[PDB]
Design an enzyme around this catalytic site. Sequence first.
Site, PDB file in Angstrom:
ATOM      1  N   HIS A 212       0.851  -1.201   0.000  1.00  0.00           N
ATOM      2  CA  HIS A 212       0.000   0.000   0.000  1.00  0.00           C
ATOM      3  C   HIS A 212       0.867   1.225   0.000  1.00  0.00           C
ATOM      4  CE1 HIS A 212      -3.722   2.336   1.137  1.00  0.00           C
ATOM      5  NE2 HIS A 212      -2.813   3.134   1.669  1.00  0.00           N
ATOM      6  N   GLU A 213       1.835   1.238   0.905  1.00  0.00           N
ATOM      7  CA  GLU A 213       2.712   2.398   1.110  1.00  0.00           C
ATOM      8  C   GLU A 213       3.637   2.626  -0.078  1.00  0.00           C
ATOM      9  OE1 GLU A 213       2.001   4.586   3.209  1.00  0.00           O
ATOM     10  OE2 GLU A 213       0.564   3.309   4.260  1.00  0.00           O
ATOM     11  N   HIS A 216       1.775   4.452  -2.934  1.00  0.00           N
ATOM     12  CA  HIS A 216       1.806   5.915  -2.744  1.00  0.00           C
ATOM     13  C   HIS A 216       3.188   6.502  -3.182  1.00  0.00           C
ATOM     14  CE1 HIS A 216      -1.995   6.632  -0.873  1.00  0.00           C
ATOM     15  NE2 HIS A 216      -1.736   5.961   0.233  1.00  0.00           N
ATOM     16  N   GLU A 239      -6.235   7.821  -1.602  1.00  0.00           N
ATOM     17  CA  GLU A 239      -6.451   6.518  -0.910  1.00  0.00           C
ATOM     18  C   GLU A 239      -7.341   5.557  -1.678  1.00  0.00           C
ATOM     19  OE1 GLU A 239      -4.792   5.632   1.673  1.00  0.00           O
ATOM     20  OE2 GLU A 239      -3.930   7.594   2.043  1.00  0.00           O
TER      21      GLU A 239
HETATM   22  N1  LIG Z   1      -4.716   0.949  10.075  1.00  0.00           N
HETATM   23  C1  LIG Z   1      -3.768   1.123   9.158  1.00  0.00           C
HETATM   24  N2  LIG Z   1      -3.678   0.233   8.153  1.00  0.00           N
HETATM   25  N3  LIG Z   1      -2.937   2.180   9.293  1.00  0.00           N
HETATM   26  C2  LIG Z   1      -1.815   2.634   8.467  1.00  0.00           C
HETATM   27  C3  LIG Z   1      -2.390   3.374   7.259  1.00  0.00           C
HETATM   28  C4  LIG Z   1      -3.073   4.668   7.698  1.00  0.00           C
HETATM   29  C5  LIG Z   1      -3.509   5.628   6.576  1.00  0.00           C
HETATM   30  N4  LIG Z   1      -4.946   5.762   6.587  1.00  0.00           N
HETATM   31  C6  LIG Z   1      -3.073   5.194   5.215  1.00  0.00           C
HETATM   32  O1  LIG Z   1      -3.772   4.438   4.550  1.00  0.00           O
HETATM   33  N5  LIG Z   1      -1.894   5.698   4.852  1.00  0.00           N
HETATM   34  O2  LIG Z   1      -1.353   5.400   3.610  1.00  0.00           O
HETATM   35 ZN   LIG Z   2      -2.854   5.140   2.041  1.00  0.00          ZN
END
Ligand SMILES: N=C(N)NCCC[C@H](N)C(=O)NO
Ligand SMILES: [Zn+2]
Length: 393
Positions: A212-213, A216, A239
């Site tokens: 996910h990160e 981005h 998001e």
């Molecule tokens: N409960 C979680 N998975 N937290 C970390 C991600 C938090 C943030 N909304 C996000 O998606 N950042 O990219």
């Molecule tokens: Zn995110």
Amino acid sequence: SSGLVPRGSHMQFVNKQFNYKDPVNGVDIAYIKIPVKAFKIHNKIWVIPERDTFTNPEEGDLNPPVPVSYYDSTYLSTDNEKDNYLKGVTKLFERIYSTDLGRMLLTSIVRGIPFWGGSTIDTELKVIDTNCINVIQPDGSYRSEELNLVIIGPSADIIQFECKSFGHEVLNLTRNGYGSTQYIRFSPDFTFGFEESLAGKFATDPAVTLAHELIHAGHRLYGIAINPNRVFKEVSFEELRTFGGHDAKFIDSLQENEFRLYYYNKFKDIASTLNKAKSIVGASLQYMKNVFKEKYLLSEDTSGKFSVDKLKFDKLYKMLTEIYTEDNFVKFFKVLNRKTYLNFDKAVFKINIVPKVNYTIYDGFNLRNTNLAANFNGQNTEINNMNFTKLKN
Ligand SMILES: N=C(N)NCCC[C@H](N)C(=O)NO
Ligand SMILES: [Zn+2]
């Protein structure tokens, strides 16, 4: 016994099997400043196994001042913890790289060098200094190293994972095509809980959370992030796009065309900056020009003049925005995961993915030829209770 190499002789994305106690050497193990010890896992990517008191001056301390949050000022303070963090992260990138999708994603990231748009003279190419780190060398000197990505520990709130970068006074680097070096706050030692009906009590696979990160990161590196002021009544489009699936579909197709055209044009401004360039401060002008021809998939003519191909733009743009998604990773991993970004997390858990008896590169928790292999039994926080300790909610 970590199982970092299930197939072959060596690791395929990460360059060394590091230990935290390995001697500093000035090349791929070094003291750096943005004074901390860091590990170079690949061309353009470093891991800094330290809580992040560094990137933000109003966050130089791990003190609690509280929605979904979790604090512990003691986490990531000993060396054994640091060694575990680093092998945990290492193992995740190897998990991500064992899939077709993750090999594509990680290649795009390494080729995504932030644009040399530093000069105040519109005919000079120059680096931007916040897209570097300072690496203490074998003799004891510094030199400045360009990089694309840093993985670092979380600041005060251990579960506020995010991807961020330093800004410019004039330019908007994450939204003009240029890009900027990306800092991921992340931990492999914690994960989150959600409910599912096959009611069932499951934990998210941390490979999917890192992915996910990293998605981005790809958006911000090619300078094509959506304005964070575009939202739903809060989740931003940025998001929704990163999660993908059916959630992305509510960005209306006419809005997408408008976004894509705005960035076609920014990539057009970048082609002509390369073309109207006569000098380079700090390798030849024509060599660095070709680093950026390669990044932005630019066409060159007999004059040696660069332009944007429309098929090639759509191809790169579509890969970064539509194909590289959380949803598509879940499909490749064959894991259980939340079905929409709109899900509320319930609990936080402490985990340890380093031992291969606990987690593998091929199966995650859902270990083959055992009872963990069926029904996502390994992500079941009651059946596989051994592997998950509950801390908040
Ligand atoms: N409960 C979680 N998975 N937290 C970390 C991600 C938090 C943030 N909304 C996000 O998606 N950042 O990219
Ligand atoms: Zn995110």
